[PDB]
Amino acid sequence: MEFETIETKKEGNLFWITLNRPDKLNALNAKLLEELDRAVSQAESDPEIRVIIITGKGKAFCAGADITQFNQLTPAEAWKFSKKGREIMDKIEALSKPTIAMINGYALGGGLELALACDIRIAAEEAQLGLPEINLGIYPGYGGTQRLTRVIGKGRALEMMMTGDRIPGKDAEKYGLVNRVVPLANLEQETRKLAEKIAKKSPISLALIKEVVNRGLDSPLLSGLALESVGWGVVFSTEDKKEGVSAFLEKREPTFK
Amino acid sequence: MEFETIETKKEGNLFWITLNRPDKLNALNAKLLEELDRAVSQAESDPEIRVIIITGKGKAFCAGADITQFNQLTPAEAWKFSKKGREIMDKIEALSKPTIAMINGYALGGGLELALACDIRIAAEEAQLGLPEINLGIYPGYGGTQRLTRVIGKGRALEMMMTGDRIPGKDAEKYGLVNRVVPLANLEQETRKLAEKIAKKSPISLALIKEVVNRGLDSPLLSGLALESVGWGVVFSTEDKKEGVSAFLEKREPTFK
Amino acid sequence: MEFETIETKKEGNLFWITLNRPDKLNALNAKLLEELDRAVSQAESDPEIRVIIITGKGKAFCAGADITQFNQLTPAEAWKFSKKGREIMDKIEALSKPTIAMINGYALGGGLELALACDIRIAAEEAQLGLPEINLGIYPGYGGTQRLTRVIGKGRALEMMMTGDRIPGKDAEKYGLVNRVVPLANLEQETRKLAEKIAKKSPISLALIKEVVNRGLDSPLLSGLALESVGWGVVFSTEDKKEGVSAFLEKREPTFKG
Amino acid sequence: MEFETIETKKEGNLFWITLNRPDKLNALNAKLLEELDRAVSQAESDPEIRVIIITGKGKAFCAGADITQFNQLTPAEAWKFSKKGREIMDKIEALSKPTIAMINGYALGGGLELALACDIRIAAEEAQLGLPEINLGIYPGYGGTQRLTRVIGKGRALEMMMTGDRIPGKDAEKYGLVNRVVPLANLEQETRKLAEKIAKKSPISLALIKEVVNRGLDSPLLSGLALESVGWGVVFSTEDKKEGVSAFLEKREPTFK
Amino acid sequence: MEFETIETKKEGNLFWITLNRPDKLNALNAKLLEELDRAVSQAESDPEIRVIIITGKGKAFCAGADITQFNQLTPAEAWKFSKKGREIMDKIEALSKPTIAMINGYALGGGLELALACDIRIAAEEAQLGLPEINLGIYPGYGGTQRLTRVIGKGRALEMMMTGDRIPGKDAEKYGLVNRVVPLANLEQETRKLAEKIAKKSPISLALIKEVVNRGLDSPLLSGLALESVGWGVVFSTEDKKEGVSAFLEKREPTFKGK
Amino acid sequence: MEFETIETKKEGNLFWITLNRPDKLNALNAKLLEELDRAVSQAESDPEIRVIIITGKGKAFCAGADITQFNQLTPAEAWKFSKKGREIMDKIEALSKPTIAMINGYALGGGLELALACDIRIAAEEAQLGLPEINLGIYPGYGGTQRLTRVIGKGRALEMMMTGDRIPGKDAEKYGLVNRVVPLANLEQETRKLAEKIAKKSPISLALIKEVVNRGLDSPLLSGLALESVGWGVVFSTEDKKEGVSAFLEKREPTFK
Ligand SMILES: CC(C)(COP(=O)(O)OP(=O)(O)OC[C@H]1O[C@@H](n2cnc3c(N)ncnc32)[C@H](O)[C@@H]1OP(=O)(O)O)[C@@H](O)C(=O)NCCC(=O)NCCS
Ligand SMILES: CC(C)(COP(=O)(O)OP(=O)(O)OC[C@H]1O[C@@H](n2cnc3c(N)ncnc32)[C@H](O)[C@@H]1OP(=O)(O)O)[C@@H](O)C(=O)NCCC(=O)NCCS
Ligand SMILES: CC(C)(COP(=O)(O)OP(=O)(O)OC[C@H]1O[C@@H](n2cnc3c(N)ncnc32)[C@H](O)[C@@H]1OP(=O)(O)O)[C@@H](O)C(=O)NCCC(=O)NCCS
Ligand SMILES: CC(C)(COP(=O)(O)OP(=O)(O)OC[C@H]1O[C@@H](n2cnc3c(N)ncnc32)[C@H](O)[C@@H]1OP(=O)(O)O)[C@@H](O)C(=O)NCCC(=O)NCCS
């Protein structure tokens, strides 16, 4: 309910998670990652919640991992540290409920890596995005080497990771790093409209779409197609499917409960 | 050569398959899938045919699939239903001859899934594309969860499948969902020009290209590269290679029989 | 360092490899492939070199490959010839040091395949890229069928391979085949700028980024992620990491000496 | 349903396909492969058939592909010939009904590839198995390079393919190439006993087991697991599940109608 | 630390988890899974623990998933139920510390799937193992369709899942389903011997071995090899490596402390 | 021709590589690895050589990497060291000519990893095999964690790697770690017999089998099968295939030139 480093708001079917360390530009530290994990678990457990939005308080969405940790890591501890925080990102990606990253400002390092773990990214024009970990003599340790490459392609991902350069929102849109950009002033509203569209749909169909997409993409195409087919069987069994098929024939809007 | 729900036309080495249920916006039903399957096998079997083109009659390319069994399908029958329909799409994808989807209008749900099975998509500016299965409380069941994701990336494919929203032709082109958009008035001409270029080329080279590209993409890069090299040996044995090489060396336009 | 078909130039920590057969539009032949292999081996061996840039002399980056032998190859010999040339491309892709293809002109057939093996591509607006092998009754045999498809997607790669038509640099940028295009007049300057930015960074971190990205991309995502995490432990053992973390805490600019 | 090179017999819910070219040791020619394809399709569509068993007439199971075809083919035709035959094997492997190869004798080259395509292999002690294609200056072309390697491991597979040496049934059992070996005199009864036990189970459960095993094995373990879980949801909607669960609850034998 | 359905015992470096529902042959119910989960998380958290052993009290290791659950589930609920239970098995498989299944008797369905999630299996000759889920009109839903097939091969895994027939310990050993079998009377001794050998090794090296083997097996061979190499970097940073290499050069016995 | 740490002998078609550091049980130092690489590359390039055999001088096959190298390595140097040595193993594995490891005695750590890189392993009953790296506070770094677990299975491989314990020849054979075990006194003759058999066969066919098997095993099955088919194309172009098929048809022994 109440957290040191984040704020949570339940708004009907919408769960809003705001990173709340604005003095440190929402830098991810051990506590914030622990709290973000809990919040996301809360949301997944609570059947009122249908869509989760992550955003940042103030100027930054997230400026990265908290560097103060780093000077006292053994290599073996560094491995475990990277794996631990990255596993929080992996949980978010595998969530059975849709997730949106609303990028209001800087999304750098750990910050962009969190955004990459969400299903959909919507950014402000004023947002700046990057993986500046190479500037510290290291490299992205929260999934960025895998997720950025897959999203914008190897050449652009390598140039961003090797130089550490930030790109503007409009460039992120161009490369497909974010689904679209809008002025900061329109961001909350554009995000709310998307989330509310999704929050109307069948929770079970949404969970199956995510499972089938995520698991299928990692597999050979025939194995992903087989997963899609078997899952279609499961969705077909549901009350929301019945509601949906009957709303269509009766020319009304379905209520997917 | 004579069908209830489709029309076929052989023009030289071009084979045109037109979905023909314009009153239902060319919606896919049991009968249409069965005929499409037969038409494609004939085209693949006919040695005069070098390129296949699939398009729709009327306002739509294909606006969806019939919902008329969905009341008498058990979950297990729904699994087999999904698989049976999708496997026809897989057969088009795996044809030894180039296929082009000429998207003249709505390409929605099953219809977009069919277009995604073709090698190349050319669309009309006026075309609308999407996967609205979520609106019925189900999800795409003819390969959309796998092929859309792979073509436009996960962020945009998830947004499209979770909202059900249609996108105009020009957005499809921006996202790489179609190769080109042109005004509907120039669609048949643009398509024909492409088809005619490909039909000039060695059928055996085209067949090997499709095999190594499709099979190689699903493998580790070194395995796909090994497939490319061994196929290169095969294409080097061909009559069209001898013609092609000696045509260039003797400064002459080659004829590929 | 004295080669027949290529020129090599060491400029600080930058190594420039220029294909040098302008009369034949820098066409790849057995000799050029052999020298390029040797030059790239040299660059990788030399600890003063941080970044390798490949480019072409004259109007072409690389306009194709030598077709002279093609009418005298057996199918089994053709398989081996394909494998031999392509393995030099694979070697460039797997290099421990960042590679940039500076595409100044025609990049066709083998020439596009060479560019595809580099980490990053920067092209002139004037450049034209294509795989016209289909026009000889064959198909790309130095990795194009795999690499182009992965880069610009199946639909556009198949159209390019099936028709054999070239695309302008602006289209290549739109498809993601190159990172960006600039006017040819500004191409060297823009490439040097990128190379110099990369050459300032930790060589061990750059080597780890390439290994993790290349190997991770070929695996299921969890396996790529596991590779990224273990690699992070290796990057934390370096002096460059100590320097970079120091520098950030002391609000000063790091110097990555290696 | 009446064939030249094969005999088909339906015994209750068992479908027996017996290769019938005893003079040529059941060697696979274009006609046999054509008829085998038609026979398996026939069995799969017939809802009375639950289990398919493939065996050979006379002393051999199958002594390979027919070598009289080989010296006619160009290299491009040889690629298409390999693909054509092997795709029939693939279809057998992908069948929604359980398949058993009853290896009564010689299973060499194409014949071993045919056996590898089935779900389960039972052989006679007297059976000899191998891939002697290298003795013709070629190598296995109907899947042996892939299926044998996966079944008996690379070391033993490479030794067999590089030497062309045959192994006895007992060695095949030891290496896991067959499930069981029994004297030829007991082979039909051992096979019948296995087929009858399988024929009693839920056909839908058996179809889902095969799909999730075959597709799952080809995927990353998490994708295979996800496929197993969605399939479990489909199997829970079946009438045979209701029967089976109540039978354990009621301490009575179940009947899978 | 005190559980309704399991017993946990911490003998030095070793953590023994014993399934404790002998009247129902250690059948997995929702409570047992929750408790097993907690116990495995505990052992994982605790640096004093180096090796985890799982076994069953009584006649059976584990006779299956509690079938009384299965009556009420909609297809969607059944999907979720499979995934939830199987995700616990996944967690055991992915644990950073070595796990041994000590299979003292019946390992059926859920029971065998639990065994398959452990790193190493040692069984009594007297043990019976199988996946009898097909007898209930269903199929293995806690990972058996994927893990059994990968361990004993597709032919025999299909035969086992399609027939539901159980196999004796010695057949399990022949197929590679267990590492070895010994008489039940020597089973605890054989298991302790193995566990104590592993427990004296570098914890960081063992954690890396498991990560590299598990992640590498699921990848193309070159990617797994890449992961092996980069991990070698990490293991060469440890105090235990210095000790081990020192000990060999000095022709003496190393003591690994896992700093 | 002449090396410091290995001996080589060319007998007809066979090339024998004998590790020659018997005072250190053939432990792999930088020098031995460099010379082994050079010898296998020479053998690959020499058209007279058809089969390569690797064996050890004295008591041992090979007792692993030379441990005197290890306390000089930094972590980043250790990464590099692993990759360098293992890439020599990779090269042996991918060689275009058949390789046999004749395991005369101890094959531990790097020695077992070297044996695992060869196509076929024949061991003496007296041979002891293992991966005792864990005994040194490290783990296998020349590919053992991947190759051993693919060959004998995860449970047996994890137990050997975690305990460091050695197994005798006969258990190696049980596990499929070696093809065959014979007494040391018969080992050279058993190895020679196998080698001479393989050296009779088509060099091009043997190269294609190795490429198709190694690359195919690493792929989804359908991609492996596609590779086998196109390769069959290439092997049908060879003089040796013409000789083999016409030899069989002409009822005579083939001579594979
Ligand atoms: C984002 C940026 C471009 C614009 O910020 P700016 O206007 O320079 O203001 P700062 O971000 O320096 O100031 C905000 C505070 O948060 C801190 N902060 C920012 N990112 C941080 C991180 N990843 N970890 C810990 N602290 C961080 C700053 O050091 C500063 O703290 P201080 O003023 O109390 O010392 C700038 O912060 C930048 O250079 N980023 C470096 C931060 C970073 O960690 N980059 C690597 C991410 S892996
Ligand atoms: C199978 C085996 C070793 C038995 O040998 P055997 O006991 O001497 O019996 P035969 O060789 O007389 O075989 C019986 C008949 O079947 C034929 N036959 C066997 N395998 C055949 C094949 N793969 N293709 C065509 N015909 C075949 C023989 O030519 C012979 O016919 P004939 O009596 O009209 O001349 C032997 O037949 C053999 O070597 N077959 C070839 C197997 C092979 O190469 N398979 C690879 C498939 S590409
Ligand atoms: C293991 C087995 C062969 C032992 O047979 P047995 O020695 O006659 O023992 P019982 O059948 O009396 O079983 C002992 C008790 O444990 C219970 N039990 C055993 N396995 C169970 C399971 N998977 N779910 C629920 N309860 C189970 C039995 O119902 C019985 O309960 P009761 O004594 O309160 O009536 C038998 O319990 C069995 O067949 N279980 C497997 C169930 C199955 O088909 N699949 C597993 C699904 S994951
Ligand atoms: C194989 C072994 C059991 C045989 O024992 P043995 O018959 O007593 O023979 P020794 O131990 O005396 O070995 C003979 C010589 O080879 C040396 N040697 C053996 N394996 C070696 C290795 N991997 N690296 C360096 N030297 C090695 C020994 O140190 C000894 O040298 P010395 O006589 O000059 O001191 C034992 O030598 C051994 O355990 N070796 C280490 C194996 C290993 O851990 N390999 C993996 C390393 S990464």
Residue numbers in the entry:
A (entry chain E), B (entry chain F), D (entry chain B), F (entry chain A): 1 to 257
C (entry chain D): 1 to 258
E (entry chain C): 1 to 259
Paper quotes:
To elucidate the molecular mechanism of Ms3HPCD, we purified, crystallized, and determined its crystal structure at a 1.8 Å resolution. The monomeric structure of Ms3HPCD consists of three distinct domains: One spiral domain and two trimerization domains. The asymmetric unit of the crystal contained six Ms3HPCD monomers, corresponding to a hexameric assembly. The hexamer is formed by dimerization of two trimers. Two glutamate residues (Glu113 and Glu133), which were known to act as catalytic acid and base, respectively, are positioned at the active site of Ms3HPCD. In the vicinity of the catalytic residues, Ala65 and Gly110 are positioned to form an oxyanion hole during enzyme catalysis. In our current structure, the CoA molecule is tightly bound at the substrate binding site, although we did not add the molecule during the protein expression and purification procedure, which enabled us to identify the CoA binding mode of the enzyme. The CoA binding site is formed between three domains, the SD and TD1 of one molecule (Mol I), and the TD2 of the neighboring molecule (Mol II). The pantothenic acid-moiety of CoA is tightly bound and buried in the pocket, whereas the 3′-phosphoadenosine moiety is partially exposed to the surface of Ms3HPCD. Four aromatic residues, such as Phe70, Phe81, Tyr142, and Trp232, play crucial roles in the formation of the unique small size pocket.
